[PDB]
Every structure is written in structure tokens, then in C-alpha cells.
Design a protein around this ligand. Structure first.
Ligand SMILES: Cc1sc(NC(=O)C2=C(C(=O)O)CCCC2)c(-c2nc(C3CC3)no2)c1C
Length: 134
């Protein structure tokens, strides 16, 4: 058993708060925000040795990242930003920092009761996206 056991599985989005404003702050344009706003992605998390994989599967777009904790990687986001990402575990919370064009956003993923709560922060704007097991 190990580092991210309680994260592993298939998760479905059940609620989203303040996501449009988070997207605005990140720079997403109108049409993408509207289509992104409707999506109910599945989040699929797996671990194989030191490598963690997080897939996002939806109607719009399927994306995937694989990474080692603390080791920077290149990532193309759902809104087509080319970012440099680093994910660490801080007190049981996955902390994902994306850097691009002198900007930064932080996405925190944590287990709370039977949910996986995703908090997305850019400058003063927070969006909370709640997932349940599928
Ligand atoms: C079909 C989907 S899902 C999704 N984003 C998520 O699902 C996101 C999260 C999650 O995994 O819940 C958590 C992190 C933030 C994003 C987008 C989308 N994000 C963006 C900008 C805000 C980054 N632009 O588009 C689309 C088109």
C-alpha cells in the first residue's frame, strides 16, 4: 500500500463552483469556457510504482498526465496552454503547480469523506470541483 492509495479509482464530477471565473482568470476564451462548463468529466487515477497517471475523460476532450512526484514535466492543458507542471504530496494533498508565460495556477486534489475535492486557484479566484466514485 502506498502514497496515493485513497486517490486511485474512477471518479465522476458531481458539482462545480466558480469554474467560469477560474477559467476567465486563467485566460480561457468564451467558447471554450461555455463548452468546458457543461462537461462532466470522469477522472481516472492509477499508480504503477512511482508513476501516477491522472486521466480526464469527457465529451469534449480526453487528456492524460503521467508523472513522478517532485519531477517537473511538460503538460498541454485542456485549454491548450503549454505549461510546466510539478506535482507533490503535501500532508496527504496532491499539489499541482502549472507555470506558463510568467503566470501560475495551483490545483489541489484531496480525499474528504467519500469525495475527491479539487480546488483550483489563480490569483484570488478559487473554483471547487467535487468528484464521487463512479
Ligand atoms: C472537458 C473539460 S474538463 C476541463 N477542465 C477540468 O476538468 C479541470 C479540472 C478537473 O479535472 O476537474 C481541474 C483543474 C482545472 C481544469 C476543461 C477545461 N479546463 C480549462 C481551464 C481551466 C483550466 N479549459 O477547459 C475541459 C474543456
Amino acid at each position: 500500500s502506498h502514497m496515493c492509495d485513497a486517490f486511485v479509482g474512477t471518479w465522476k464530477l458531481v458539482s462545480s463552483e466558480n469554474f467560469d471565473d477560474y477559467m476567465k482568470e486563467v485566460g480561457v476564451g468564451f467558447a471554450t469556457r461555455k463548452v468546458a462548463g457543461m462537461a462532466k468529466p470522469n477522472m481516472i487515477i492509477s499508480v504503477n510504482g512511482d508513476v501516477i497517471t491522472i486521466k480526464s475523460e469527457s465529451t469534449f476532450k480526453n487528456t492524460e498526465i503521467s508523472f513522478i512526484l517532485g519531477q517537473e514535466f511538460d503538460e498541454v492543458t485542456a485549454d491548450d496552454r503549454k505549461v510546466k507542471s510539478t506535482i507533490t504530496l503535501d500532508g496527504g494533498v496532491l499539489v499541482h503547480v502549472q507555470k506558463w508565460d510568467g503566470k501560475s495556477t495551483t490545483i489541489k486534489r484531496k480525499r474528504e469523506d467519500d469525495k475527491l475535492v479539487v480546488e483550483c486557484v489563480m490569483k484570488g479566484v478559487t473554483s471547487t470541483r467535487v468528484y464521487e466514485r463512479a
